[PDB]
Amino acid sequence: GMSNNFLGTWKLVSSENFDDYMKALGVGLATRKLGNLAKPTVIISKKGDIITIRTESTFKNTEISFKLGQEFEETTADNRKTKSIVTLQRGSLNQVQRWDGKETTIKRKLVNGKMVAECKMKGVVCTRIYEKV
Numbered sequence: 001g002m003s004n005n006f007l008g009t010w011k012l013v014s015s016e017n018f019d020d021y022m023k024a025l026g027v028g029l030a031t032r033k034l035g036n037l038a039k040p041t042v043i044i045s046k047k048g049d050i051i052t053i054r055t056e057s058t059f060k061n062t063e064i065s066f067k068l069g070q071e072f073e074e075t076t077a078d079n080r081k082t083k084s085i086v087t088l089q090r091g092s093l094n095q096v097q098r099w100d101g102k103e104t105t106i107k108r109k110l111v112n113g114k115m116v117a118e119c120k121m122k123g124v125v126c127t128r129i130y131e132k133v
């Protein structure tokens with residue numbers, strides 16, 4: 001299953017094309033202004049087969065808890081109510097969010113010791129890189 005190298009606390013060190021990713025989700029300017037200035041912290045823990053991903057920022061905190069392959073109700077940082085699933089493809093943690101007939105994905109894979117999150121929406125791609133502490 002999920003490699004134990006995901007487990008721990010991660011810190012954003014790079015974000016590319018985040019403003020345009022938020023634009024695609026319908027995020028307003030003022031909210032985007034703060035989402036760009038945010039340097040979140042992502043904690044990934046595991047209790048049994050239930051994986052938890054927690055995001056901590058001064059602006060918004062979030063937390064999801066799921067079993068791989070099982071749909072679950074999620075409330076996103078921008079307050080979307082999504083029916084989401086997390087799958088594992090070649091050691092990549094791929095999260096899909098569906099709402100209002102729309103859909104976006106967050107793919108998280110480890111690269112040379114760093115967690116790389118790919119955000120995708122209608123051909124708009126954002127790349128966020130985290131370093132472990």
Ligand SMILES: CCCCCCCCCCCCCCCC(=O)O
Nearest residue numbers: 022035038040057077078106117128
């Ligand atoms: C915690 C980030 C604050 C941004 C709030 C503005 C609304 C945008 C929400 C989009 C969520 C994108 C998160 C990508 C996954 C990650 O980088 O861990």
Ligand SMILES: [Cl-]
Nearest residue numbers: 038039057058
């Ligand atoms: Cl922050």
